[PDB]
Design a protein around this ligand. Structure first.
Ligand code: THP
Ligand code: CA
Length: 129
């Protein structure tokens, strides 16, 4: 899999972000994770955490998996990196997201993320507290 450029347009919530990709605005939904909706517990913390990480980043990159690149809502599905660091991973590592929505064909970083959830759970962080 390959990292590709993108630039931030707007942080939306814990697991969606508006990016410019190939010069077009699109909403991205983070692969393999589920954050709490803003209305729910840790939702604002998730949103704040995604927001901070993407807005502070000099460099954003989009990494598509091997499967579907767009969902049924027209959202791009990807791994999103902020200065070389995966946002999908960081959210899980901090207990702000669960590993989730694991579909066959779009699951390359499954085990990497499941290692991060185990650590966050060990540590009883946020959702796991
Ligand atoms: C992460 C991801 C979500 N989805 C869809 C399934 C869910 O459908 P439903 O809307 O019918 O529940 C929805 C969950 O995303 P959200 O957590 O943003 O709502 O997005 C995919 O289709 N593929 C994916 O890889
Ligand atoms: Ca969600």
């Amino acid at each position: 899999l390959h990292k590709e450029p993108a630039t931030l347009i707007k942080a939306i919530d814990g697991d969606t972000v508006k990016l410019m990709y190939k010069g077009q605005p699109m909403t991205f939904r983070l692969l393999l994770v589920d954050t709490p909706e803003f209305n729910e517990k840790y939702g604002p913390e998730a949103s704040a955490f995604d927001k901070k990480m993407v807005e502070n980043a000099k460099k954003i990159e989009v990494e598509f998996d091997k499967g579907q690149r767009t969902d049924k809502y027209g959202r791009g599905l990807a791994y999103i990196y902020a200065d070389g660091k995966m946002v999908n991973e960081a959210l899980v590592r901090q207990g702000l997201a669960k590993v989730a929505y694991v579909y066959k064909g779009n699951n390359t970083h499954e085990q990497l993320l499941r290692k991060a959830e185990a650590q966050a759970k060990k540590e009883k962080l946020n959702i796991w507290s």
